[PDB]
């Protein structure tokens, strides 16, 4: 689970050929990273969308 | 022949004591069913 | 009649627990030999039990509470 990436592994539902009414489990991107040090020094998970928008504003946010 | 229950005191508790039933967030729920009905006692 | 005198007279005055209630929260706080005449029998006279416990009761809940 990653906090500032928003949501979690959130449930969904699977389709098929002439769909058979099934289920999926949505998983986001899971990366434990520790990028910046503002007073941070804090390891935490992240998602790759938030990785590519680390240079959006994510050094303190 | 032999029957089911020939319990001892540890036997009559340790499934149904107030912390045993209270413990797992679940048996206390069905105890609260037993309270919201409110029968002759609670813990046994 | 009896009880309003013999109750209202006592300790509405503001003297204190080891000070004024020496007669009640110390002296007749020995509830012994009145109780201890209770169930010993040979007493014949009841009302002293909850009467006196009532007086020490009001002694504590007023006088040994107001400070």
């Amino acid at each position: 689970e990653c906090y500032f990436t928003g949501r979690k592994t959130v449930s969904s539902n699977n389709r098929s050929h002439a769909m058979n009414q099934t289920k999926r489990v949505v998983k986001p991107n899971l990366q434990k990273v520790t990028i910046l040090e503002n007073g941070e020094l804090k390891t935490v998970w992240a998602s790759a969308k938030a990785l590519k928008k680390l240079p959006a504003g994510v050094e303190r946010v | 022949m032999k029957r089911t229950y020939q319990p001892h005191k540890k036997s009559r508790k340790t499934t149904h004591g107030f912390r045993s039933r209270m413990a797992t967030k679940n048996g206390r729920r069905v105890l609260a069913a037993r309270r919201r009905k409110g029968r002759a006692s609670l813990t046994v | 009649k009896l009880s309003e005198t013999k109750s209202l007279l006592k300790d509405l005055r503001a003297l204190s627990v080891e000070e004024l209630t020496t007669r009640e929260a110390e002296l007749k706080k020995e509830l012994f030999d009145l109780r201890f005449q209770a169930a010993a029998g040979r007493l014949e006279n009841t009302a002293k039990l909850d009467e006196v416990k009532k007086t020490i009761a009001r002694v504590k809940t007023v006088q040994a509470e107001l400070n």
Partner: protein
């Protein structure tokens, strides 16, 4: 302080009298050393010790429902000699 409940008068009570013993009652939340020194205070009688025993509650029927009569700790007041017995 005087939180002795009552004495107890059996036919063994006279044997306690001859033995310089007693059968006294106190509240449950108690200790035999504590009621020992309380007995020493309000009585000035010289105690050896007290025995242990209490009584279970007696849940029979008393009336048209179950008489749930309660227990009480039967205090066996073991004295020493050379003191003031109480004959009440």
């Amino acid at each position: 302080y005087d939180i002795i409940r009552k004495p107890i008068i059996t036919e063994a009570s006279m044997a306690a009298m001859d033995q310089k013993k007693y059968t006294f009652e106190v509240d449950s939340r108690a200790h035999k050393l504590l009621i020992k020194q309380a007995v020493e205070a309000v009585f000035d009688v010289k105690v050896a010790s007290v025995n242990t025993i209490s009584v279970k509650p007696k849940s029979k029927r008393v009336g048209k429902y179950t008489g749930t009569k309660s227990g009480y700790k039967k205090a066996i007041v073991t004295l020493t000699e050379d003191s003031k017995t109480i004959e009440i």
